[PDB]
Amino acid sequence: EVQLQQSGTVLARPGASVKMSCKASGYSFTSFWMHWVKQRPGQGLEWIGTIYPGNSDTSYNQKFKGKAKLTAVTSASTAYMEVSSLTNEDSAVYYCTRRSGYKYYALDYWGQGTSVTVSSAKTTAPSVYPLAPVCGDGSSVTLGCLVKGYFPEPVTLTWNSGSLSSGVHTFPAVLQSDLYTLSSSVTVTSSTWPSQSITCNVAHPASSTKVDKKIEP
């Protein structure tokens, strides 16, 4: 019944500070150590620090000393963490997890995590490009879509409103100068396309954008 709820997805400009919450429930907040762990976009888990509520004791990783500020408000049963002087390296997913006492002595409960994106980027709809094979002249034919220059994550891309799914390869979005770029490959037999229309449907919710791009020759 122990439940760790964390604040939402935060998009912070560089150099700023970001304060995130972690509401506990189903257990005595003040009797356990709440830990915070950071996970950068691509790497493993990093221990940040830990607070014991109802006495406010803290323990930080040397690296995070002036960077992450752990606090707790017992009347809200909520642990807080302020990451300041936001850089690129601060973009990651943050988990508050609880260190159980007797039975286990381990981080047995974890929060869904908080995604922080440090960027100067403003909200930008995508540019969806059709990728028809080169020129005229096998058994299968690879097609694709290029979704680039958008802010922020995420985008959703379907092939033929979803009828096509086997053979589809949607690659992870990557940031190339303030914006994101995603691409998708769809491999279908020769007799399918161009004999059949293959549309690429791109949605960028943050911008209220749904875009279709039919792959012609």
């Binding site: 221990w47 059709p130 490959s185």
Partner: protein, 217 residues
């Protein structure tokens, strides 16, 4: 500073086989009370980590009995006799004693026979070319192992700039990987060359896989 050196970082396994994730401390982590606070967590893609083993060799409640811990000197070992499809993801050891340090990670993945990428180059789309831009995409689909390299060329002249790659994770159906390189230029800059090459060098052939086109079509 205590160091948890976890190996290997990648462990392809065939289903039903026993997996062995090791984790070594740069010196004994046995606490003063005589206890060793060495746990193991698994973070499945998209979810938060979860407790598996605690106190070195003790299985957390609700944890599949195929999981087991052990560990003495500075060497601890996680074993998954009979790997099922649900066990796949990233495993972390964690010494939560003095200064809590996480192991690096050991991505449990599936093993299949080697397979060469299937390359496909796509010239810029006219629509992208109207905005003044011009990306040249190369899909390097369905291969194995995941270790692959891409070199672009323009008029036989190598081009190391503006190339943004992005790999998919191990395919659920065929256990293969797929990569996506992308050379982004300017329209004018694009329109001042003919040959656009992309050679994929994979573990399979000692000879790069070449994909080219000429605006001469």
């Amino acid at each position: 500073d205590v160091l948890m050196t976890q190996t290997p970082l990648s462990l392809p396994v065939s289903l039903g086989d026993q997996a062995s994730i090791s984790c070594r401390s740069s010196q004994s982590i046995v606490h003063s009370n005589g206890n060793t606070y060495l746990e193991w967590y698994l973070q499945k893609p998209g979810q938060s980590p979860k407790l598996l083993i605690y106190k070195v060799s003790n299985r957390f409640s609700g944890v599949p009995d195929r999981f087991s811990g052990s560990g003495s000197g500075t060497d601890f070992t996680l074993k998954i006799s009979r790997v099922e499809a649900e066990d796949l993801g990233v495993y972390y050891c964690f010494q939560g004693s003095l200064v809590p340090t996480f192991g690096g990670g050991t991505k449990l993945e599936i093993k299949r026979a080697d397979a060469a990428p299937t390359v496909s180059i796509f010239p810029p789309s006219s629509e992208q070319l109207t905005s003044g831009g011009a990306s040249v995409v190369c899909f390097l689909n369905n291969f194995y192992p995941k270790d692959i390299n891409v070199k672009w060329k323009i008029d036989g002249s190598e081009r190391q700039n503006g190339v943004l790659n992005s790999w998919t994770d191990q395919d659920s159906k065929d256990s293969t990987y797929s990569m996506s390189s992308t050379l982004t230029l300017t329209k004018d800059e694009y329109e001042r060359h003919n040959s656009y090459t992309c050679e994929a060098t994979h573990k399979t052939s000692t000879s790069p896989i070449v994909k080219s086109f000429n605006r001469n079509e």
